[PDB]
Design a protein around this ligand. Structure first.
Ligand SMILES: COCCNC(=N)NCCC[C@H](N)C(=O)O
Length: 272
């Protein structure tokens, strides 16, 4: 059953995020970001019933909230990544310990010529696509392939300071939410060309709004966290058509200013 999760790892955001998190002018309202982040944690843990592991903020790591970039979990195995920005590399320490306590088999990306950000990795339920980007390189992608041996891994070039999931993510079984920009469409075609699996797509006019979270929840069924109609009205009208999903609008406007989207803020785990 694709999208099953029992546990999520998240991490509180530091005061330092407002001035120190990496970003490609928009002033960050750190109190509003904390509010948005608390609301997102509420959905995962309270509303959907996942067991959430809330990591404490570390003021020395302005981007620590973005736990997705530091770990990729597939089944009973966790790849601890080697993030592409060297300043984010100590974020792995706390995540390794949390994933240890969750009884995952841990593989650490230690190779000094390898980098990977978890935000470059799209797992479809059938295979992985891995963005080759400013943050993820070919070697990082190879070590992901070596770690998740049961699954095919293919790479796709990603331009211009983007991550693969800057413009896509899974919206359901067999369903890739994908943005309409020249970048996103060029990337989708490459992915579709490299795989024999025939995916369906859900095309949205705002690349950013293609980053959503799908879960398959006991006694709830298909569930999708997506950006709000106040943030991306024309994309929310597209998700509204998913009549068999429980749709949950989640705001992420403040963390978006330092390139933080929905998937970025949690690592999801399915535990026996
Ligand atoms: C889904 O990935 C979207 C892109 N964002 C991402 N991977 N991580 C969050 C932002 C991390 C950091 N602030 C940066 O600019 O690198």
């Amino acid at each position: 059953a694709f999208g099953r999760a029992t546990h999520a790892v998240v991490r509180a955001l530091p005061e330092s995020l407002g001035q120190h998190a990496l970003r490609s002018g928009e002033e960050v309202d750190v109190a509003r970001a904390e509010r948005q982040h608390q609301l997102y944690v509420g959905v995962l843990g309270s509303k959907l019933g996942l067991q959430v592991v809330e990591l404490p903020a570390d003021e020395s790591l302005p981007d620590c909230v973005f736990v997705e970039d530091v770990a990729v979990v597939c089944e009973e195995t966790a790849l601890i990544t080697r993030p592409g920005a060297p300043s984010r590399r100590k974020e792995v320490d706390m995540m390794k310990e949390a994933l240890e306590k969750l009884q995952l088999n841990i593989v650490e990306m230690k190779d000094e010529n390898a980098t990977l950000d978890g935000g470059d990795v799209l797992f479809t339920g059938r295979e992985f696509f891995v963005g080759l980007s400013k943050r993820t390189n070919q070697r990082g992608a190879e070590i992901l392939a070596d770690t998740f041996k049961d699954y095919a891994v293919s790479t796709v070039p990603v331009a211009d300071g983007l991550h693969l999931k800057s413009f896509c993510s899974m919206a359901g079984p067999n369903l890739i939410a994908i943005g309409s920009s020249e970048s996103a469409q060029k990337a989708l075609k490459i992915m579709q060309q490299m795989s024999d699996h025939r995916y369906d797509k859900l095309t949205v006019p705002d690349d950013i709004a293609a980053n959503c979270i799908y879960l398959n929840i006991p006694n709830k069924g298909h569930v999708l966290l997506h950006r709000t109609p106040e943030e991306y009205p024309e994309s929310a009208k597209v998700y509204e058509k998913l009549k068999d999903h429980m749709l949950i609008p989640v705001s992420m406007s403040e963390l978006e200013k330092v390139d933080g989207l929905l998937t970025c803020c949690s690592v999801l785990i399915n535990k026996k």
